[PDB]
Amino acid sequence: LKSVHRWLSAADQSEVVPGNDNIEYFSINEHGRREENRLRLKTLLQQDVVHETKTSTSAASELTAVVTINDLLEACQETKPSISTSELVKLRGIYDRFQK
Amino acid sequence: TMDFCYFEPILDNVVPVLDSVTFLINEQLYSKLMDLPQEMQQIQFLHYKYNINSMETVVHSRDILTSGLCQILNCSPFP
């Protein structure tokens, strides 16, 4: 978990297809709709042939999320699961002798 | 060519006028277009070479203005 968190932080999952839309404004873009940016984006989407989206899924390279000893030490000496042997002494105390 | 075709006139001068039109232009021509100093000059440049006359030219969707260099992408609202 800590290693995948570190890998996510390092990758940062940012800077994807920046500045896709081109600058195409024109002077006569007035005397009508004031949402011309939305219409231009609509057309830029529409000029595409079809939603291919045949992208290579292996580009992520998720296998690189490897652990390190420093990451290993993120255990931070977690609390014990068993409170104390004192609570369990009798367990073997009765079985110092052979079992019944 | 055609042996025959269908034709029918538009009665009562009911000719629609488009509200918006989209154009696709190549790098050189588009740059030459926007380099003009004012809006009126750009409109005149559009008018001249394409022979498009306002309130008298009817244009359609996906019409190629010149072969492989520029095209009208679409029209709205009417085809």
Curated annotation (Swiss-Prot), chain A:
Organism: Saccharomyces cerevisiae (strain ATCC 204508 / S288c)
Protein name as catalogued: Peroxisomal ATPase PEX1
Source superkingdom: Eukaryota
Disulfide bonds: none
Entry remark concerning the domains of this protein: AAA-cassette D1 is required for interaction with PEX6. ATP-binding in AAA-cassette D2 is required for interaction with PEX6. ATP-binding and hydrolysis in AAA-cassette D2 is required for proper function in PEX5 dislocation.
Note, other: Present with 2100 molecules/cell in log phase SD medium.
Family membership: Belongs to the AAA ATPase family.
Quaternary structure (record): Interacts with PEX6; forming the PEX1-PEX6 AAA ATPase complex, which is composed of a heterohexamer formed by a trimer of PEX1-PEX6 dimers. The PEX1-PEX6 heterooligomers associate with the peroxisomal importomer via interaction of PEX6 with the peroxisomal membrane anchor PEX15.
Record localization: Cytoplasm, Cytosol; Peroxisome membrane
Function: Component of the PEX1-PEX6 AAA ATPase complex, a protein dislocase complex that mediates the ATP-dependent extraction of the PEX5 receptor from peroxisomal membranes, an essential step for PEX5 recycling. Specifically recognizes PEX5 monoubiquitinated at 'Cys-6', and pulls it out of the peroxisome lumen through the PEX2-PEX10-PEX12 retrotranslocation channel. Extraction by the PEX1-PEX6 AAA ATPase complex is accompanied by unfolding of the TPR repeats and release of bound cargo from PEX5.
From Swiss-Prot, chain B:
Role played: Component of the PEX1-PEX6 AAA ATPase complex, a protein dislocase complex that mediates the ATP-dependent extraction of the PEX5 receptor from peroxisomal membranes, an essential step for PEX5 recycling. Specifically recognizes PEX5 monoubiquitinated at 'Cys-6', and pulls it out of the peroxisome lumen through the PEX2-PEX10-PEX12 retrotranslocation channel. Extraction by the PEX1-PEX6 AAA ATPase complex is accompanied by unfolding of the TPR repeats and release of bound cargo from PEX5.
Family: Belongs to the AAA ATPase family.
Protein name in UniProt: Peroxisomal ATPase PEX6
Species annotation: Saccharomyces cerevisiae (strain ATCC 204508 / S288c) (Baker's yeast)
Domain notes from UniProt: AAA-cassette D1 is required for interaction with PEX1. ATP-binding in AAA-cassette D1 is required for attachment to PEX15. ATP-binding and hydrolysis in AAA-cassette D2 is required for release from PEX15 and proper function in PEX5 dislocation.
Superkingdom of the source species: Eukaryota
Subunit structure: Interacts with PEX1; forming the PEX1-PEX6 AAA ATPase complex, which is composed of a heterohexamer formed by a trimer of PEX1-PEX6 dimers. Interacts with PEX15; anchors PEX1-PEX6 heterooligomers to the peroxisomal membrane and mediates their association with the peroxisomal importomer. Interacts with UBP15.
Compartments it resides in: Cytoplasm, Cytosol; Peroxisome membrane
Further details from the record: Present with 1630 molecules/cell in log phase SD medium.
Gene expressing this chain: PEX6
